[PDB]
Amino acid sequence: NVSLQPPPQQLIVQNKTIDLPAVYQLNGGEEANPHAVKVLKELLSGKQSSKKGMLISIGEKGDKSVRKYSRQIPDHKEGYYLSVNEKEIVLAGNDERGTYYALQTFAQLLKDGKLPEVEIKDYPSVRYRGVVEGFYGTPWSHQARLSQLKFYGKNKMNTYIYGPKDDPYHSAPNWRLPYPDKEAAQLQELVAVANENEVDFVWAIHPGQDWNKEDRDLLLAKFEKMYQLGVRSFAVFFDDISGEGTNPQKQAELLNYIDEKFAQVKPDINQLVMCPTEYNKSWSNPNGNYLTTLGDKLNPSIQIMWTGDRVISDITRDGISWINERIKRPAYIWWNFPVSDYVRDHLLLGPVYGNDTTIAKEMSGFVTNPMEHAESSKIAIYSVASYAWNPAKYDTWQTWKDAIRTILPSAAEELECFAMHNSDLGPNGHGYRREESMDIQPAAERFLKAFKEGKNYDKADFETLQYTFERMKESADILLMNTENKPLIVEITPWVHQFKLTAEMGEEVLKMVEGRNESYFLRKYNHVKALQQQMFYIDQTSNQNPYQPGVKTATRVIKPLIDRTFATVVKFFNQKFNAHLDATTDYMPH
Ligand SMILES: CC1CCN(c2ccnc(NCCc3ccccc3)n2)CC1
Numbered sequence: 001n002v003s004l005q006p007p008p009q010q011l012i013v014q015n016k017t018i019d020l021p022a023v024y025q026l027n028g029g030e031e032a033n034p035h036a037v038k039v040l041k042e043l044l045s046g047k048q049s050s051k052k053g054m055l056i057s058i059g060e061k062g063d064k065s066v067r068k069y070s071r072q073i074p075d076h077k078e079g080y081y082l083s084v085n086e087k088e089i090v091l092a093g094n095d096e097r098g099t100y101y102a103l104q105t106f107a108q109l110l111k112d113g114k115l116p117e118v119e120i121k122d123y124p125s126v127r128y129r130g131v132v133e134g135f136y137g138t139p140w141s142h143q144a145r146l147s148q149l150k151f152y153g154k155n156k157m158n159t160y161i162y163g164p165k166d167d168p169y170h171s172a173p174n175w176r177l178p179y180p181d182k183e184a185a186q187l188q189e190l191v192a193v194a195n196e197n198e199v200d201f202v203w204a205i206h207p208g209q210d211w212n213k214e215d216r217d218l219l220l221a222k223f224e225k226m227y228q229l230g231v232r233s234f235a236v237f238f239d240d241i242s243g244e245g246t247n248p249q250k251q252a253e254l255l256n257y258i259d260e261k262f263a264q265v266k267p268d269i270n271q272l273v274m275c276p277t278e279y280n281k282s283w284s285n286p287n288g289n290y291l292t293t294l295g296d297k298l299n300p301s302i303q304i305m306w307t308g309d310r311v312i313s314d315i316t317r318d319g320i321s322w323i324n325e326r327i328k329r330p331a332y333i334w335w336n337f338p339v340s341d342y343v344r345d346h347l348l349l350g351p352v353y354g355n356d357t358t359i360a361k362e363m364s365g366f367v368t369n370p371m372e373h374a375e376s377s378k379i380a381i382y383s384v385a386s387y388a389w390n391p392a393k394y395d396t397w398q399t400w401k402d403a404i405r406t407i408l409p410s411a412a413e414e415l416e417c418f419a420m421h422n423s424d425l426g427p428n429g430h431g432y433r434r435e436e437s438m439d440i441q442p443a444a445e446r447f448l449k450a451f452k453e454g455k456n457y458d459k460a461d462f463e464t465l466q467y468t469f470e471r472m473k474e475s476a477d478i479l480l481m482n483t484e485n486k487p488l489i490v491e492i493t494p495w496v497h498q499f500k501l502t503a504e505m506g507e508e509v510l511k512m513v514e515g516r517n518e519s520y521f522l523r524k525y526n527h528v529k530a531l532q533q534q535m536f537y538i539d540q541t542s543n544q545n546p547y548q549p550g551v552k553t554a555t556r557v558i559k560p561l562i563d564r565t566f567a568t569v570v571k572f573f574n575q576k577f578n579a580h581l582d583a584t585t586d587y588m589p590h
Pocket of ligand 1: 134135136239275279305307311334336339341342
């Protein structure tokens with residue numbers, strides 16, 4: 001059955017299916033977007049017959065090939081019309097990017113050499129959609145970035161804001177310097193791949209550290225050299241700046257200057273974006289001037305980034321009106337999820353939710369700040385893509401499952417299990433939390449409650465927990481050895497080990513609850529203690545960083561259930577046999 005991510009604006013399925021044609025005639029192969037034609041030719045290995053076979057027509061509005069279907073093509077940037085029936089196939093973009101988007105949709109329809117009969121009219125609700133490379137921690141590799149960009153094109157994200165922290169040429173002081181040949185050629189390769197995948201490579205300059213005519217000049221000259229390298233989209237960051245540099249009139253002046261002498265002078269600049277000094281409502285001064293002045297003086301064609309009501313927050317109608325009213329334009333949203341650079345011992349693999357689905361007209365852009373774990377971030381990235389394309393049809397849970405099935409088809413259920421219990425951030429200085437382990441929350445609560453007050457627990461809840469731990473160990477072991485996405489596995493390995501140990505500990509603790517005799521109980525107790533020690537070992541030796549070192553997993557519901565069940569059963573044991581076992585859950589070498 002027809003599943004499409006992102007879901008099209010309009011879709012009609014006929015409940016018939018046609019074969020991908022053995023023999024086809026291609027119309028418009030020459031005048032249509034070469035990137036789209038390339039995908040189409042990839043999917044086709046029947047024979048191009050010049051006078052026979054099923055017509056396939058590909059083109060942008062105004063091409064000869066799609067003249068007949070012009071009224072069906074949506075009048076929206078990046079829009080397209082796609083049609084499949086017995087007679088013919090139509091892939092008609094409103095523009096070149098739209099034709100490519102058609103083809104991305106077409107590739108998802110094609111299953112086992114068969115196509116549904118369908119008619120689609122489609123376009124994005126939000127103008128700019130993608131990823132800002134905006135996390136602290138170990139930068140992504142070159143290969144990681146190439147793989148991201150291909151994923152962005154598949155999910156119709158048109159925006160990549162480049163900024164690896166190990167590249168000094170977009171930061172102080174080296175922003176003034178041209179890229180040396182080797183680095184330039186690498187960035188060049190990113191640009192080429194971004195272009196092939198219809199993604200805007202947005203080169204971000206971060207000069208905030210370092211206001212005269214000559215600084216203005218050097219920036220403009222640098223922008224020019226990045227143009228020669230093939231860059232067509234640009235961002236200027238002021239999150240960074242202090243003192244005089246925080247003056248919004250002077251920020252506007254430089255940006256309006258860049259617009260006039262560079263962006264308006266070139267034939268083909270797409271995005272010009274700035275990040276303001278006050279970038280969320282919490283960190284702005286209600287008693288000050290900065291956002292209204294920016295909104296007044298900054299040219300209308302320049303985007304202003306915004307994180308919402310707080311630095312980590314989900315965007316609401318009230319939030320978006322607050323900012324738009326000040327900047328006098330639709331805010332370009334920077335969403336600080338799934339970035340984990342302030343909770344580095346946690347993976348954030350849960351669904352994308354919380355953003356208001358009715359406000360697409362009030363946002364110019366929506367970009368996600370991801371984790372230092374590139375592959376792992378694809379779960380949220382795919383979901384963001386889906387949300388930003390079609391927010392009205394956004395389905396958090398189905399999109400989450402679809403992302404997981406896309407990223408790891410050979411072990412989707414196992415990754416779902418792992419991801420379900422690795423979602424929450426735990427307590428943190430931003431107060432931002434996510435749900436986790438919702439499937440077993442009721443079983444866990446009722447189990448604890450009963451076990452607490454020396455009332456009997458339900459056998460079914462015991463079994464649910466038992467089943468959960470068994471499933472976690474199966475999932476951990478299958479994921480560790482999975483070779484379909486080795487980079488993914490490499491990223492999560494430390495947590496997978498910790499997650500397996502958590503499950504083993506849970507099983508041992510359940511055996512203490514059933515405790516048949518004193519000797520068996522003591523065996524399980526000693527095993528639990530040794531497993532706690534291994535978890536500390538991993539916590540002390542993996543993922544070491546100055547900020548949140550180590551590895552935490554299943555922290556919201558599962559680990560606390562195990563900890564409390566352990567402390568309770570040990571206290572019961574101590575009372576019964578008049579013993580003095582340590583009931584604590586965090587072992588300690590001192
Ligand atoms: C638009 C702005 C740009 C700068 N921001 C970054 C940059 C990198 N990482 C993150 N991680 C989020 C937690 C956090 C960390 C440091 C400072 C504040 C909030 N935020 C905040 C958003």
